[PDB]
Amino acid sequence: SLQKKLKGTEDELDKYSEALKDAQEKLELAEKKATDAEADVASLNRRIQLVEEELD
Amino acid sequence: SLQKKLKGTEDELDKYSEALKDAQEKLELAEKKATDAEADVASLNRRIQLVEEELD
Amino acid sequence: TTALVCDNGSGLVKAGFAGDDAPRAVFPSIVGRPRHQGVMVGMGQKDSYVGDEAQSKRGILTLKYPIEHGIITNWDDMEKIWHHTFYNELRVAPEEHPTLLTEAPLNPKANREKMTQIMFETFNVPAMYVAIQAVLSLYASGRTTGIVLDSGDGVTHNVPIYEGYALPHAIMRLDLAGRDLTDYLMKILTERGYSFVTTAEREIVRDIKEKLCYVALDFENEMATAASSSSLEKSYELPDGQVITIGNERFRCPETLFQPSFIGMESAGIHETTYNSIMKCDIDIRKDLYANNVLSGGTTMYPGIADRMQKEITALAPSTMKIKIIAPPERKYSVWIGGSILASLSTFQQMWISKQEYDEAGPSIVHRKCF
Amino acid sequence: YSGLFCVTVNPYKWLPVYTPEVVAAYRGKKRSEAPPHIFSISDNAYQYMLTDRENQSILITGESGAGKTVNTKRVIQYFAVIALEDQIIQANPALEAFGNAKTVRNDNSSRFGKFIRIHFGATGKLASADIETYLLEKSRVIFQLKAERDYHIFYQILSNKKPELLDMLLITNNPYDYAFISQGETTVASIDDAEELMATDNAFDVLGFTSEEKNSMYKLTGAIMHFGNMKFKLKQREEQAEPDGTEEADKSAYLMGLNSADLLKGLCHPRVKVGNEYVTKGQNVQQVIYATGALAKAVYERMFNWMVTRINATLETKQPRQYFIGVLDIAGFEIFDFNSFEQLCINFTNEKLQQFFNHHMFVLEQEEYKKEGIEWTFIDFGMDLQACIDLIEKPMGIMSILEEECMFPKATDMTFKAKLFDNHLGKSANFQKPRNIKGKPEAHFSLIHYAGIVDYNIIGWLQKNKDPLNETVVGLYQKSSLKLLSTLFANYGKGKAKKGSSFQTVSALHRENLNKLMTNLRSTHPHFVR
Ligand SMILES: Nc1ncnc2c1ncn2[C@@H]1O[C@H](COP(=O)(O)OP(=O)(O)O)[C@@H](O)[C@H]1O
Known part of the structure; x- marks a missing residue:
């Protein structure tokens, strides 16, 4: 009689696995984006200090 | 019997839900850092032209 | 007829056709050989893996690079690299395609000489030409x-x-x-x-x-x-x-x-x-x-x-x-892009080295005006 | 009659020569004896088809507005008589719009090579009609000369008689506003353009396609018009192009069915495929402008070809279609005092045609001789003209030098001229110096053709021959929310002739199209009308 319990557990497990996969996908995406944006801002900031000493 | 595997799947499912929680927290912090960096780089990419015209 | 642009480099082979916008085949210039014994009979496994395949079986193999500092040290597995490039990545018969190859400045002369000897005798290409990498990079960059x-x-x-x-x-x-x-x-x-x-x-x-x-x-x-x-x-x-x-x-x-x-x-x-x-x-x-x-x-x-x-x-x-x-x-990819541009010029089609030219002048013809 | 030709000067007043009585009464008289008329050659083509079981070709040759339309009309009438003309004339205003533009010698000049295939059955009875377009010039959609206009359609839309089109396309009434067009002649006393807009809309509504489809056609043309005003600047301390003005970008995207930021990103930063990865390519202002121009020319020509397909689908009848007899309408061997790249292309086409006819007449004279049993002078009559063709198409010819020059890094018009001279002057037979007569504007070199010595001008050829199509934006079009995704359905190992997106030249596409047009004509026994 516990087979329905087993099947329901399998279903919620599958749902949670899909959820985890989607969350990992969004995580790696946003992390690549944040790292790239930080690279750009650091580069251009150093460039700003260089053009500042240039102006000086 | 089925109990050991059932509760083991339960424990790893809860732990994967914990992984979901922490991954979502990382998603929120990633969104924050990306948006703040975006505002900063907006300021910087609009004032670099003024700096270059000053030196011109 | 179209020419092949093979920027063999040292660590990545980039190949393709002259007139394209990017190389078609890009894979590491690696030859792998198995170092363990192999137990399953009927596996029928081969003796040496080339290119991108050797990176999948990377844990079983011992990886060699046939080019050390621009210079080619191992010639047999370099012929293997070229064979893989022509037949398994591009799927072209080199008997009807001129081939443009690149090389770094200030290299030994025997490098070029053996390269052309191989390209004419092992692969029977109708024409070939060895170019300097920096010049092709300038071509692709659009400067002069x-x-x-x-x-x-x-x-x-x-x-x-x-x-x-x-x-x-x-x-x-x-x-x-x-x-x-x-x-x-x-x-x-x-x-x-x-x-x-x-x-x-x-x-x-x-x-x-x-x-x-x-x-x-x-x-x-x-x-x-x-x-x-x-x-x-x-x-x-x-x-x-x-x-x-x-x-x-x-x-x-x-x-x-x-x-x-x-x-x-x-x-x-x-x-x-x-x-x-x-x-x-x-x-x-x-x-x-x-x-x-x-x-x-x-x-x-x-x-x-x-x-x-x-x-x-x-x-x-x-x-x-x-x-x-x-x-x-x-x-x-600038060297390859410039190489494609160059081989695509109508002004260039009289600067190849022909088959009969080589057959009459030996491999020494590489250093002469047909550069 | 003039040998293998049929020459016809148009009478300006009505004659009884077009009454159906002569049409019906010619049936049973021969070509050799009956006095000249196009009904003669029409019947001769018909009976040639029926005896040799092959196609024939009628090559009507003249200027638009000298009677070509009505000449072809009476041809198709005679063909119906000897057994869908109304449909041809009904759908004609569409082509008249989408393929005619004002030149100096004519205000309704045809640019594309119209060509109507009239099929038949086994019993030689009227079955169906087919139509194909060739050699439609794309350079007009972007660059116009000092004395000529763009295609008629932009002006007809610019006629305010349809204010709904203007207020739905954001088109301001002022024609100077739009840069793709304003460089040509703004407006001329050519025709009643408003009325022509109405006649085209009427022909559209009575053609098989819906009102939404005409709406999309009009809006697409307006988007092509909106492409020209885009503005790009170099970046801060780099060589990259970035847009400063975004408003026309936003409105063109809202029209086209794409995202504005996404289209701007696809223009400034193309992505190309290197093996199994994608890497972003860099662009400067000149490159992005050439890409924009090539995109506009491409979308226009695509919409045109698909419109012709729709026209043919409307015309299509299910009757079995056997051997056909085609009639061809092509541009003329135009000469001016400021010939340019487009005129060179036109003259190259007409060179191929004239050499084709010359070889045809050669074989015909050999036929006369082998009939008469008197066979001499076994030299052909084509090579004497082919020698001039070899100066355009062949490697190291003018077109190949032009392609190489627009591929080279820092090429300029003076360098182009220097290479032309260094590689042809004296070493060739027909290439030679220019001539300065009566204070003509300018000439950089002169070719000789069958139709005389022509002096051509170099200035602008490099810039106007480039056709770099942008693959990322083409994919964007494939992913549109419009009919555009059909026009751009799919466009751009084991042996691949895939020329890159950057290694594209109007001259090369034109040579390919001319090759395939010759392959379509050379299978049919031809006939010529002057
Ligand atoms: N994003 C990168 N950052 C730093 N180094 C890189 C990057 N991509 C590739 N390389 C290095 O470039 C080398 C390959 O350069 P490449 O242009 O292929 O020269 P070759 O064609 O002669 O092998 C590799 O050794 C790799 O370490």
Whole structure:
């Protein structure tokens, strides 16, 4: 009689696995984006200090 | 019997839900850092032209 | 009829057809052989794996590179690389395709001579031609003057060209490149606890380098920032889990390009050899050379390399000059793009080396006017 | 009659020569004896088809507005008589709009090579009609000369008689506003353009396609018009192009069915495929402008070809279609005092045609001789003209030098001229110096053709020959929310002739199209009308 319990557990497990996969996908995406944006801002900031000493 | 595997799947499912929680927290912090960096780089990419015209 | 452009490089083979916008086949120039015994009868496994396939079976194989510093050391597996390129990646019969190949400046002559001997006798191509890499890089960049720094994986060189005339006495060649940077990174990770010794772990280290290293704008200030903060640490995931974290090593690795004394070399950084190659040139063209400093090749792909190199060359040159570093995003394929452009010129179709030309003049015809 | 030709000067007043009585009464008389008329050659083509079981070709040759339309009309009438003309004339205003533009010698000049295939059955009875377009000039959509206009459609839309089109397309009434067009002649006393707009809309509504489809056609043309005003600047301390003005970008995207930021990103930063990865390519202002122009020319020509397909689908009848007899309408061997790249292309086409006819007449004279049993002078009559063709198409010819020059890094018009001279002057037979007569404007070199010595001008050829199509934006079009995704359905190992997106030249596409047009004509026994 516990087979329905087993099947329901399998279903919620599958749902949670899909959820985890989607969350990992969004995580790696946003992390690549944040790292790239930080690279750009650091580069251009150093460039700003260089053009500042240039102006000086 | 089925109990050991059932509760083991339960424990790893809860732990994967914990992984979901922490991954979502990382998603929120990633969104924050990306948006703040975006505002900063907006300021910087609009004032670099003024700096270059000053030196011109 | 169409020509093939094979930029064999040293560490990546890039092939394709002349007239395309990008190389069609890009795979590592690697030959792998199994080092374990092999138990399953009927596996029917082969003796040597070539190219991109050998990176899948990387854990079983021992990986060789047939090109050391531009120069070709092993010739049999280089024929294997070329055979794989022609038949398995491009699927073309080289009996009806002219082939354009590239080479670095200041190489042995036997390199070119054997290359053409092979291309004419083993593969029977109807024509062939060996080109310099920096010239093709300039073609693809769209300039006609400018000093080009072509940092590949075996060799780094400067070739100053003005108005279409190359000044050979000012050509510099340096044997510091991406493979030396990989070895320095392998050796420098050890101090943090990680050990990579196998030729199969050298590839993992190359991946770490590509994905995490960068050039610091100010080396001492970045060293202080790493010694104080922790905002520099990034983590990488090995093939078997086992996350590793690196700090200083992120920018201490490509700094070897600007301080070759890190790996015990005597020479000067890429910025200083660029400046010296400029100062070897006539005084009238140094303006244009300063203003047209073109980067190409894989080792020029680190974030911050252009800003760092501009800062250095600016602090070296006089204050009146405008220093500019031209660094396209499709940088690491510039040699191939220029090669395709070149082989696609109607003006070029009388500068090939023909089959009968070779048959009558021997392999020595490579160094003559048919260059 | 003039040998193998049929020459016809148009009478300006009505004659009884077009009454159906002569049409019906010619049936049974021969070509050799009956006095000249196009009904003669029409019947001769018909009976040739029926005896040889092959196609025939009628090559009507003249200027638009000298009677070509009505000549072809009476041809198709005679063909119906000897057994869908109304449909041809009904759908004609569409082509008249989408393929005619004002030149100096004519205000309703045809640019594309119209060509109507009239099929038949086994019983030689009227089965169906087919139509194909060739050699439609794309350079007009972008660059116009000092004395000529763009295609008629932009002006007809610029007629305010449909204010709903203007207020739905954001088209301001002022024609100087739009840069793709304003460089040509703004407005001329050519025709009643408003009425022509109405006649075309009527022809559209009475053609098989819906009102939404005409709406999309009009809006697409307005988007092509909006492409021209885009503005790009170099970046801060780099060589990259970035947009400063975004408003026309936003409105053109809102029209086209794409995102504005996404289209701007696809223009400034193309992505190309290197093996199994994609890397972003860099662009400067000149490159992005050439890409924009090539995109506009491409979308226009695509919409045109698909409109012709729709026309043919409307015309299509299910009757079995056997051997056909085609009639061809092509541009003329135009000469001016400021000939340019387009005129060179036109003259190259007409050279191929004239050499084709010359070889045809050669074989015909050999036929006369082998009939008469008197066979001499076995030299052909084509090579004497082919020698001039070899100066355009062949490698190191003018077109190949032009392609190479627009591929080279820092090429300029003076360098182009220098290479032309260094590689042909004296070493060739027909290439030679220019001539300065009566203070003509300018000439950089002169070719000789069958139709005389022509002096051509170099200035602008490099810039106007480039056709770099942008693959990322083409993919965007494939992913549109319009009919555009059909026009751009799919466009751009084991042996691949895939020329890159950058290695594209109007001259090369034109040479390919001319090759395939010759391959379509050379299978049919031809006939010529002057
Ligand atoms: N993004 C990157 N950052 C730093 N180094 C890179 C990057 N991509 C590739 N490389 C290095 O470039 C080298 C390959 O350069 P490449 O242009 O292929 O020269 P070759 O064609 O002679 O092998 C590799 O050793 C690799 O370490």
